[PDB]
């Protein structure tokens, strides 16, 4: 939980889509 943590979070969702 952080900036980090929500840096990763967007990143795992576009990486979801491909």
Known sequence: FXFDTLK??????????T
């Open 8 to 17: 990763n979070l967007a990143g795992k969702v576009i990486g979801a889509l």
